[PDB]
Amino acid sequence: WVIDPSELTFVQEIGSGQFGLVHLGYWLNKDKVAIKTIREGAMSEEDFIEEAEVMMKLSHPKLVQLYGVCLEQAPICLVTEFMEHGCLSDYLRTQRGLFAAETLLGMCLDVCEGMAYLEEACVIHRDLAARNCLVGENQVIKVSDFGMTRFVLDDQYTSSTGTKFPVKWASPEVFSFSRYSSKSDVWSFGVLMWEVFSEGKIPYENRSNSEVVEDISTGFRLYKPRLASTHVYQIMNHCWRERPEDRPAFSRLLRQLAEIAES
Numbered sequence: 422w423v424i425d426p427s428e429l430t431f432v433q434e435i436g437s438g439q440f441g442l443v444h445l446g447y448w449l450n451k452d453k454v455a456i457k458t459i460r461e462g463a464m465s466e467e468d469f470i471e472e473a474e475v476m477m478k479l480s481h482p483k484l485v486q487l488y489g490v491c492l493e494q495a496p497i498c499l500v501t502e503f504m505e506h507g508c509l510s511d512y513l514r515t516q517r518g519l520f521a522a523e524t525l526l527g528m529c530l531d532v533c534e535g536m537a538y539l540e541e542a543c544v545i546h547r548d549l550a551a552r553n554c555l556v557g558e559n560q561v562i563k564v565s566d567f568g569m570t571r572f573v574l575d576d577q578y579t580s581s582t583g584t585k586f587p588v589k590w591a592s593p594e595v596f597s598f599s600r601y602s603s604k605s606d607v608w609s610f611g612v613l614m615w616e617v618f619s620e621g622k623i624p625y626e627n628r629s630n631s632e633v634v635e636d637i638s639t640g641f642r643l644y645k646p647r648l649a650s651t652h653v654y655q656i657m658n659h660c661w662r663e664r665p666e667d668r669p670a671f672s673r674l675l676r677q678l679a680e681i682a683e684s
């Protein structure tokens with residue numbers, strides 16, 4: 422799982438993601454790859470390195486595949502499969518008005534399938550959102566960055582009371598207690614479905630973190646996107662049930678959403 426620096430070449434910078442810059446490149450005797458160069462100070466590197474081998478064993482057609490880590494020299498690099506079309510969030514926003522509702526549902530299903538695999542593996546994403554899903558060939562969506570907030574060194578992001586905490590995607594037991602589970606990922610998935618059917622609109626736009634907490638705690642929920650059917654919106658609302666035990670598992674979501682899609 423360790424990749425030597427001599428085994429990588431960097432071709433072009435493609436953009437910036439969690440923890441630092443990403444390049445298109447090649448990996449010796451292997452493939453074309455994406456390579457993320459971890460910025461100094463952003464990541465708990467030793468903690469991540471301990472987990473990297475087990476993260477690589479996670480492998481599913483709808484999850485971004487970790488291929489290895491280049492760690493001989495600072496800064497360290499993570500290497501993955503290459504996805505051509507960037508973040509799902511940007512992809513929806515830049516092409517707003519073009520997508521059929523069926524295509525939007527299909528994106529949610531791809532995400533749901535990857536999350537079902539994580540659920541079965543007992544791996545919690547912790548920060549699932551359109552902004553960390555990537556878009557590949559034929560508009561396949563793959564889930565990325567699962568578990569990575571365990572290594573983010575910015576306390577304002579990782580603490581529930583932090584000024585940058587991703588409260589818009591957090592279930593009440595996460596925003597209250599940092600009680601993460603696959604059922605808190607299910608809540609996040611409901612907000613992501615909202616993002617997709619809204620073609621990358623910002624959820625709770627111009628609500629402060631404290632306002633989102635208050636709204637959710639007093640029963641407010643995101644409005645139905647025009648492109649979401651009443652049935653799809655019912656499923657979204659299932660993901661935002663207050664009690665995690667009342668939210669469907671991803672395995673159940675996947676069945677429900679498939680039946681809607683295939684009929």
Ligand SMILES: */C(=C/C(=O)N(C)c1cc2c(cc1F)nc(Nc1ccccc1C)c1cncn12)CN(C)C
Pocket residue numbers: 435436437438439443455456457485499500501502503504505507508511552555565566
């Ligand atoms: C989101 C996407 C984006 O615009 N780009 C260019 C992008 C592509 C990309 C990224 C990160 C990006 F910012 N990361 C990986 N793979 C990856 C994932 C996790 C850890 C390491 C690695 C290498 C990847 C694979 N194909 C394409 N990418 C940017 N937002 C607007 C912030």
